[PDB]
Ligand binder design. Sequence first.
Ligand SMILES: Nc1nccc(-c2cc3c([nH]2)[C@@H](CCF)CNC3=O)n1
Length: 336
Amino acid sequence: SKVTTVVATPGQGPDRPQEVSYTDTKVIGNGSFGVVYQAKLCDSGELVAIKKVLQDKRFKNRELQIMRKLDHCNIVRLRYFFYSSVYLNLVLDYVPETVYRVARHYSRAKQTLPVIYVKLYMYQLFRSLAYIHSFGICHRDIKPQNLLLDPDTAVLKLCDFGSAKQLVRGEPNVSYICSRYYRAPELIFGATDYTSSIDVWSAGCVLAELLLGQPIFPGDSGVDQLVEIIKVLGTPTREQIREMNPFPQIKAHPWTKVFRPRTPPEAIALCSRLLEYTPTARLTPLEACAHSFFDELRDPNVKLPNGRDTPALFNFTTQELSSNPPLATILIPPHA
Ligand SMILES: Nc1nccc(-c2cc3c([nH]2)[C@@H](CCF)CNC3=O)n1
């Protein structure tokens, strides 16, 4: 079995390369960005994913620089990085599943994911967003494929920071980020002055899709997407439009009627508050963690269906809570 030994730089703390050996390298992904390999570290037998991307000669890699700053239980960990022949290689913790793959399994068994998992996956996503947003970092590509899962522990890790950017007021940013189905209306309308609330919309779309078993705003064009949105939210008022920034006439489909009939009311209430036209009316991620849909996760007796304890849910930091420190009394329950 072929070993690769490289001199790699730890992702966090002090810039101090060490020699790293790995084996059992195989391709696991292959989109636009480049390649993802899986490999096994010789020293520890730990499995890693290596995201290999072509490195611009001019610039510093933005994805890399954002990942070196991030340290959160619901975000994939940058273990090391190195250069090879010129390519940047991101050595990441290996995570075996994704929300996309798990959802599609229930979907084709004509079944929906049990709500305990909807609760767990969505809360952990909202945590990861609370954390990056506190740095003014917007992910800009929230979608089921980017939500990795460990099915055994029910841990969710956000990944793919290839579109992520710090958003600064008064700076314009490209409106062509983010994947179809998950794109906030302001993005569809071509705003360049959007905020981090675009992630919130994208998160509301994942929530709705886990509840429905299929995407809620599908469409091969902007127009078709907008019609699906209008069909649920009703036509946007002129003030709502000006708020998204840059003309069919439908009344709102009552959110209870959108979903199958045994759908928990707090689940629907949470969607209606994420999927708002006006970007400033959307819940923040921290507010979303504190919503009553997630109350069962705050129950001292909650367990995973495999009989394990829930994963880490309450270890908030001052950084993570900073958008609204008083939510801590809701978020960290008596027993935690
Ligand atoms: N299995 C596993 N484990 C850790 C990280 C990854 C991973 C990183 C990235 C991907 N997978 C895919 C996810 C989007 F489709 C592509 N881009 C990434 O950054 N995959």
